[PDB]
Amino acid sequence: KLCSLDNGDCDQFCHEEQNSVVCSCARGYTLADNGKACIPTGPYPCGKQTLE
Amino acid sequence: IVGGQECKDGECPWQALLINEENEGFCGGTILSEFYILTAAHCLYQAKRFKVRVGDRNTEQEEGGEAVHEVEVVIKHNRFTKETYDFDIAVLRLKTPITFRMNVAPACLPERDWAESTLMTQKTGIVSGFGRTHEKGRQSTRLKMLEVPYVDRNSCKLSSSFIITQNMFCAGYDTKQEDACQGDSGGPHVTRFKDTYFVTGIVSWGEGCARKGKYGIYTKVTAFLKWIDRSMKT
Numbered sequence: 511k512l513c514s515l516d517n518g519d520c521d522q523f524c525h526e527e528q529n530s531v532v533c534s535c536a537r538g539y540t541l542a543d544n545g546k547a548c549i550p551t552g553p554y555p556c557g558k559q560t561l562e
Numbered sequence: 563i564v565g566g567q568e569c570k571d572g573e574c575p576w577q578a579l580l581i582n583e584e585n586e587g588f589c590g591g592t593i594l595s596e597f598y599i600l601t602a603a604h605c606l607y608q609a610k611r612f613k614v615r616v617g618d619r620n621t622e623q624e625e626g627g628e629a630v631h632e633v634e635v636v637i638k639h640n641r642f643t644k645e646t647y648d649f650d651i652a653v654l655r656l657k658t659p660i661t662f663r664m665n666v667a668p669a670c671l672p673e674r675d676w677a678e679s680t681l682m683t684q685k686t687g688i689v690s691g692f693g694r695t696h697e698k699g700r701q702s703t704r705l706k707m708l709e710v711p712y713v714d715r716n717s718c719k720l721s722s723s724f725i726i727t728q729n730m731f732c733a734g735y736d737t738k739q740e741d742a743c744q745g746d747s748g749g750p751h752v753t754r755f756k757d758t759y760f761v762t763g764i765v766s767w768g769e770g771c772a773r774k775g776k777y778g779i780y781t782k783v784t785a786f787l788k789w790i791d792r793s794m795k796t
């Protein structure tokens with residue numbers, strides 16, 4: 511259930527509140543409109559291998 | 563690193579190298595942000611004065627991405643102790659900010675509860691460094707990485723001739739010939755989750771390198787998240 515079922519469909523951090531999944535992201539990412547995906551705010555975000 | 567493979571172009575961008583007065587690496591570090599490096603407290607005794615090099619993969623050629631940075635403040639955990647290597651963690655503030663580019667980027671700091679239930683329960687983590695290529699060998703001139711399995715905490719305590727505190731965890735192999743080694747100390751242990759890499763450990767100690775019935779011992783970063791946060795503000 512919730513966060514124990516495939517990380518709650520979250521890209522990164524998953525937390526359970528009032529029997530409901532709440533997703534969040536590392537510093538330098540913003541949560542997308544769908545409330546699940548994490549979008550980098552700028553160049554060279556944390557945790558990504560570099561390509562240019 | 564004993565075994566494993568070379569970090570290819572762009573694959574280990576959070577790697578830092580602590581270098582002595584002779585420009586020789588004696589320990590590793592992890593890039594956390596433009597001003598901060600995570601390392602092991604025990605490393606802060608292996609040189610009177612040192613600098614931090616980033617963006618390097620081959621210590622014998624100039625690739626164009628390398629940068630040396632001076633240290634402004636050394637923040638060592640006050641509860642650190644040489645008797646057991648308990649609380650083996652330090653944070654370094656640099657004099658000038660790191661400019662991110664190809665081969666130079668930070669690793670993500672995770673949240674404690676999520677990291678413990680979801681990252682540290684994954685099958686493996688990744689360790690990296692320029693340290694020895696075998697227990698009695700020389701240091702590597704090439705940056706290497708190696709996938710290391712998380713090891714059951716009970717099995718680890720049974721295998722060890724030295725105390726494994728609540729601030730440590732074990733990773734690696736029972737008999738397979740693959741491990742971190744001397745010189746890799748202070749370096750990154752990271753865990754991949756949906757193509758994003760989070761800091762999960764700091765290379766700390768072992769009874770030699772890749773010995774049978776022995777594992778690599780790492781500082782448990784998740785126990786130090788509030789401490790790290792505090793250090794990066796003051």
Ligand SMILES: C[C@@H](C(=O)N1CCOCC1)N1CC[C@H](NS(=O)(=O)c2ccc(-c3ccc(Cl)s3)s2)C1=O
Pocket residue numbers: 644645646647724741742743744745747765766767768769770771772777778779780
């Ligand atoms: C058991 C330990 C030791 O002397 N301790 C640990 C507990 O605190 C007191 C002293 N020890 C024995 C010799 C060894 N030194 S060493 O071979 O230069 C060495 C440094 C780092 C090593 C690592 C192997 C795997 C990981 Cl992870 S890192 S292998 C080492 O660290």
Ligand SMILES: [Ca+2]
Pocket residue numbers: 618619620621622623624625628
């Ligand atoms: Ca180089």
